[PDB]
Design a protein around this nucleic acid. Structure first.
Ligand SMILES: [Mg+2]
Ligand SMILES: [Mg+2]
Ligand SMILES: [Mg+2]
Ligand SMILES: [Mg+2]
Ligand SMILES: [Mg+2]
Ligand SMILES: [Mg+2]
Ligand SMILES: [Mg+2]
Ligand SMILES: [Mg+2]
Ligand SMILES: [Mg+2]
Ligand SMILES: [Mg+2]
Ligand SMILES: [Mg+2]
Ligand SMILES: [Mg+2]
Ligand SMILES: [Mg+2]
Ligand SMILES: [Mg+2]
Ligand SMILES: [Mg+2]
Ligand SMILES: [Mg+2]
Ligand SMILES: [Mg+2]
Ligand SMILES: [Mg+2]
Ligand SMILES: [Mg+2]
Ligand SMILES: [Mg+2]
Ligand SMILES: [Mg+2]
Ligand SMILES: [Mg+2]
Ligand SMILES: [Mg+2]
Ligand SMILES: [Mg+2]
Ligand SMILES: [Zn+2]
Lengths: 118, 86, 158, 122, 50, 203, 53
RNA sequence: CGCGACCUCAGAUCAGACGUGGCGACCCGCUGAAUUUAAGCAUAUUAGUCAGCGGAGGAAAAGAAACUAACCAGGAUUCCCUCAGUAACGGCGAGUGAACAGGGAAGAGCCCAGCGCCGAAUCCCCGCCCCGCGGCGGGGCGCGGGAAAUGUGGCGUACGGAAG
């Protein structure tokens, strides 16, 4: 066999994947950020309740590692209601105020007085 | 225009809070800390300032693992044993 | 600026001497430390002599001190081979050995050989196995009389 | 009633997880009651539910890891969270076998020439 | 600066929460020496660093 | 035994056989890099009498120390002080290039421990030393009792406390009347014992 | 081909052994035993091999 | 041309380990000033000191003579008293300045390479069985892999040693 290109490059060798004799950590770590510990409490301010009675949404305080997809999946599991969209912001306190706009078949006022805020 | 009117242009900052020592001494253009020497792997530490040593040594912060290893030394690092129950 | 009459003096304090000063306030604490460690050692090697092994008659080197005989390092190998003590068994039965010592003389060697023969007369060797005594072991009536001696074993007096 | 860690240990795992998420629901609705403005009974009960969750999770983690080191008790390579966590130099210390290994030179020397048991007549 | 970063904003959030006064039920405690909050910070006087 | 012939052959260095071998080896060692691992020692007999037993866990590095004295690392001339201390050009470093060799080999291999080192060639501008290293956590070393002394934490980085042979040759110690200024632990221990007042309690 | 540095090194070391005036004590290992004598000797040496474990 | 040995040298998220950084009073290696003193100052002095750099341990280092001596001779190292502000160095100016012997604290000695002789007699690692397992070790089994003759182990080291 002959060499066309006058540059010698490193030949491609075989490389195996890991077959370790023991796992590093023995147990997989429990998800400390789950659907209960992601949302903390809904706001009961006058702007919050005016927004739940006008825009058919809810207002929550969540921790800052939450995605919009995570907040959507969390509210869907915790209250069995479908979610149109999510708008998040970080308050000057350091909390993450989330805005969970519901699907139009649900009404935020009856959802609120069954989840306790009224 | 050496003093008061030259203090008006103070609006863009040199340092920022470092992410190893927490002090506002992480230079931005050099990108090295002046308090701990951040990209260097060794902590900046000089014997010509005993006060700058004393401000952050082993005793200063939490000793979050080291007070635990002190009270494990006072029983010789027992492991796997529990006191016998009721 | 010297005054009228007196010595002229050169005190060696021109360096920084206060930063390096050894002060002896742990002198009695260290005496009690040596004493407690010595007593713990003496009861640890429990019937054996407290002063350790036996060390030979040796006279001092120089012109100032050769009239005086003192304790040496260890019994020389020629001394041991004349006294019939094996050079590895001497350190087991409590005889200090050093191989470095020469012997240019005769009566110093004979004094050390007499001292080794007197030591092997004097020592009480317990059996290596307590229930089964052996050949070179002393008898059980002087096993009950064996005890430590304080002070050096056969002190070398001038 | 007042939950405690004695009677949770024979309790099997899915029972502990459903008691856990019941306590999670209860803590969340206590937080809702705190924000809406509830009673001092609810605000006192918040700490009780938090420590309830804490000792249920303690029992779950202990009963998991005891079974883990039972599973790895016989094997030669066991994981790092299961290995003994003494100090670093104390793990890098030679073990009591390799410090007790004696070469054959000094084995036969301490055979032939043992340190005897002697005393000197004064 | 309305173009804050997340680290600087969270730092300012902590300083803003620290700038609140002592709750009045504390100076009914037994061995109390705290008469007020001595480490308070007005935004004209002390410019906080950064 | 062959090692007697090998060590007398290495005693004859200016003879043509060894002069050919040394200049060819020195060419090759210059063509290689600065700190590369040799797979077996070049001088087996010297390696053995320094401590290398060809078992699993001893490695040989072949390192290049740039040859010469030591000029004072100061800007242009400019030592700011008395005319004694304008020494810049003709100063000499207190340790040997063999000790510098083994210390930078031991710094590059921090998990390993320097045993000794020896000489494999020299040029006008470099000298080449092979440094012996021991893997202190390999069990062929660790289960052998008369070489598990190296696996203790007191022997951590011997090359930089100056405890190998070429490190000891610069500490100025040894028995005798030639070495009065090191009795004690070392030279600094000698100085420290001499320049203290023993102020007693009762004086 | 721009060969790697070890291939270049192990070739031009052989070039230097062909260039330099090799002393007879090192030249003498090039004067080597020929083929049919060597295969005869190794056929004989196969009879007296030491044992495996 | 190909195949197969070895040698040099690469690539692996390969199997198992190890080092990194901190404190730094005490310890070891290097680097290393100037104030100051000399009634100035340049050699000296401050001073192998401060600052700088690297590396540890519970102590470090040193350590079992290529020694001291010149005697009727002592005998590893370390520390204390003394030698001694002595011998000696020094614009022989200012200043600097140890050791031997002696008395004590302590006390302990040893091992390789070589020269050799024993069929590599040596070592590491994986698989299986029994035991122990929070300092991965003890035993047996593998026509299991590897290191090693470019030298592992046993005897043997200047006090001699080996063999018959
Ligand atoms: Mg700038
Ligand atoms: Mg540093
Ligand atoms: Mg006057
Ligand atoms: Mg004594
Ligand atoms: Mg041996
Ligand atoms: Mg202002
Ligand atoms: Mg000068
Ligand atoms: Mg020399
Ligand atoms: Mg791997
Ligand atoms: Mg370090
Ligand atoms: Mg002056
Ligand atoms: Mg003056
Ligand atoms: Mg002046
Ligand atoms: Mg000096
Ligand atoms: Mg310093
Ligand atoms: Mg330590
Ligand atoms: Mg030591
Ligand atoms: Mg040592
Ligand atoms: Mg002495
Ligand atoms: Mg006097
Ligand atoms: Mg001086
Ligand atoms: Mg003396
Ligand atoms: Mg051999
Ligand atoms: Mg000797
Ligand atoms: Zn920093």
């Amino acid at each position: 066999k002959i060499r066309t290109s006058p540059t010698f490059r490193r030949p491609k060798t075989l490389r195996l994947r890991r077959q370790p004799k023991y796992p590093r950590k023995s147990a997989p770590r429990r998800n400390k950020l789950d659907h209960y510990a992601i949302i903390k409490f809904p706001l009961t301010t006058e702007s919050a309740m005016k927004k739940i009675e006008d825009n058919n949404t809810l207002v929550f305080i969540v921790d800052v590692k939450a995605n919009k997809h995570q907040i959507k999946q969390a509210v869907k599991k915790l209250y069995d209601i479908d979610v149109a969209k999510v708008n998040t912001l970080i308050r000057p306190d350091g909390e993450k105020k989330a805005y969970v706009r519901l699907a139009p078949d649900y009404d935020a006022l009856d959802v609120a007085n069954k989840i306790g805020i009224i | 225009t050496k003093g008061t009117s030259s203090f008006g242009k103070r609006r863009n900052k040199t340092h920022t809070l470092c992410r190893r020592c927490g002090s506002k001494a992480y230079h931005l253009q050099k990108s090295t800390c002046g308090k701990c020497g951040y990209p260097a792997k060794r902590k900046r530490k000089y014997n010509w300032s005993a006060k700058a040593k004393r401000r952050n040594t082993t005793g200063t912060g939490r000793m979050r693992h080291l007070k635990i290893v002190y009270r494990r030394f006072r029983h010789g690092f027992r492991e796997g044993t529990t006191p016998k129950p009721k | 600026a010297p005054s009228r009459n007196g010595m002229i003096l050169k005190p060696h304090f021109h360096k920084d001497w206060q930063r390096r000063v050894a002060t002896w306030f742990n002198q009695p604490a260290r005496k009690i430390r040596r004493r407690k460690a010595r007593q713990a050692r003496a009861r640890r090697i429990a019937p054996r002599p407290a002063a350790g092994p036996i060390r030979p008659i040796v006279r001092c080197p120089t012109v100032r001190y050769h009239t005086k005989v003192r304790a040496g390092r260890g019994f020389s190998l020629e001394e041991l081979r004349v006294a019939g003590i094996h050079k590895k068994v001497a350190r087991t039965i409590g005889i200090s050995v050093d191989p470095r010592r020469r012997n240019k003389s005769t009566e110093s060697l004979q004094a050390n050989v007499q001292r080794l023969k007197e030591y092997r007369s004097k020592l009480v060797l317990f059996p290596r196995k307590p229930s089964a005594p052996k050949k070179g072991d002393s008898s059980a009536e002087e096993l009950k009389l064996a005890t430590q001696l304080t002070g050096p074993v056969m002190p070398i007096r001038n | 009633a007042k939950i405690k860690a004695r009677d949770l240990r024979g309790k099997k795992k899915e029972e502990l997880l459903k008691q856990l998420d019941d306590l999670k629901v209860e803590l969340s609705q206590l937080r809702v009651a705190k924000v809406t403005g509830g009673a001092a009974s609810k605000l006192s009960k918040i700490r009780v539910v938090r420590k309830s969750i804490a000792r249920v999770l303690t029992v779950i983690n202990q009963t998991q890891k005891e079974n883990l080191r039972k599973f790895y008790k016989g094997k030669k390579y066991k994981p790092l969270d299961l290995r003994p966590k003494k100090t670093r130099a104390m793990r890098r210390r030679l073990n009591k076998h390799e410090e007790s290994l004696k070469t054959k030179k000094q084995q036969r020397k301490e055979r032939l020439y043992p340190l005897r048991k002697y005393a000197v007549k004064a | 600066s309305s173009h804050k970063t997340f680290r600087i904003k969270r730092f300012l959030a902590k300083k803003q929460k620290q700038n609140r006064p002592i709750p009045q039920w504390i100076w009914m405690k037994t061995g109390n020496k705290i008469r007020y909050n001595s480490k308070r910070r007005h935004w004209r006087r002390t410019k906080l660093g950064l | 035994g062959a090692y007697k012939y090998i060590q007398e052959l290495w005693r004859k260095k200016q003879s043509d056989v060894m002069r050919f071998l040394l200049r060819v080896r020195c060419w090759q060692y210059r063509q290689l890099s600065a700190l590369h691992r040799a797979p077996r020692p070049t001088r087996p007999d010297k390696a053995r009498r320094l401590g290398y037993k060809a078992k699993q866990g001893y490695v040989i590095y072949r390192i290049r120390v740039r040859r010469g004295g030591r000029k004072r690392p100061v800007p242009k001339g400019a030592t700011y002080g008395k005319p004694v201390h304008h020494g810049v050009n003709q100063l000499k470093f207190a340790r040997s290039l063999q000790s510098v060799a083994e210390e930078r080999a031991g710094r590059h291999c921090g998990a390993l421990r320097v045993l000794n080192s020896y000489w494999v060639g020299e040029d006008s501008t470099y000298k080449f030393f092979e440094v012996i290293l021991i893997d202190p956590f390999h069990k062929a070393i660790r289960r052998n009792p008369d070489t598990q002394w190296i696996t203790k934490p007191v022997h951590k980085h011997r090359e930089m406390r100056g405890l190998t042979s070429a490190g000891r040759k610069s500490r100025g110690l040894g028995k005798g009347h030639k070495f009065h200024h090191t009795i004690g632990g070392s030279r600094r221990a000698a100085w420290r014992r001499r320049n203290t007042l023993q102020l007693h309690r009762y004086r | 081909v721009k060969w790697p540095r070890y291939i270049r090194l192990q070739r031009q070391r052989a070039i230097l052994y062909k260039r330099l005036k090799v002393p007879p004590a090192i030249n003498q290992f090039t004067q080597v035993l020929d083929r049919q004598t060597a295969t005869q000797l190794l056929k004989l040496a196969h009879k007296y091999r030491p044992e495996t474990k």
